[PDB]
Write a protein that binds this DNA or RNA. Structure first.
Length: 204
RNA sequence: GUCCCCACGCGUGUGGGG
């Protein structure tokens, strides 16, 4: 009942890597290969994130898996694989953690039956604040507002046309219910979990 | 500027029968 974290530094000289970097769907098919058997048996929840490019340095993909991944299934010269390490998220009540989450703040419009993205930063934060509170977490806050800043807001258009709003959050949260908090980290947060969203990363 | 599928809420009713 633990987790695995893998750091994949992709090689921009690879044609397979450039393809997967442009297409979150093609990245999803490639990353699924490492835990192909566990997904076939329906006991795996794959979560990944393309880390924000600080510039200069190569693309970094962080992959979280419930079962141990076998990264020998990647193409030759695809990525520099940093060995997967067992992740025990030992959480106590009232513990405060720095978090990073690229997610899809959206709502199911009842007039259309469709799922559309939220527009204002005020309701994007309100969405995050709701999802964390439902998942046993709670956003810390000062007197200006909640402890979170939106760093990226890009409208993704995956050609398999999949259209998902990708919002990158970063700030500080608190653990209220550690049992709920453990499950939230394992499940992920919000839609588009296959397309590189949902992965909630926590650090002290 | 949400493309497809599955499950399920909240609020408020319409019409018929005895």
């Amino acid at each position: 009942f633990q987790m695995w974290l893998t750091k994949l530094v992709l090689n921009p000289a690879s044609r397979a890597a450039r393809r997967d970097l442009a297409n979150p769907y093609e990245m999803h098919r490639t990353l699924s290969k490492a835990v192909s058997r566990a997904l076939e048996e329906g006991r795996e929840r794959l979560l990944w994130r393309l880390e924000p490019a600080r510039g200069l340095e190569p693309p970094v993909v962080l992959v979280q898996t419930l079962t141990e991944p076998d990264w020998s299934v990647l193409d030759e010269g695809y990525a520099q694989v940093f060995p997967p390490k067992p992740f025990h998220p030992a959480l106590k009540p009232g513990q405060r953690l720095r978090f990073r989450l690229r997610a899809n703040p959206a709502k199911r419009l009842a007039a259309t039956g469709k799922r559309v993205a939220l527009k204002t930063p005020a309701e994007k934060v309100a969405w995050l604040e709701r999802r964390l509170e439902e998942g046993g977490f709670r956003l810390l806050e000062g007197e200006r507002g909640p402890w979170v800043q939106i760093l990226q807001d890009t409208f993704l258009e995956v050609r398999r046309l999949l259209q998902v709003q990708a919002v990158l959050f970063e700030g500080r949260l608190e653990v209220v219910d550690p049992e709920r908090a453990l499950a939230t980290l394992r499940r992920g947060v919000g839609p588009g979990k296959a397309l590189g969203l949902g992965l909630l990363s926590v650090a002290p």
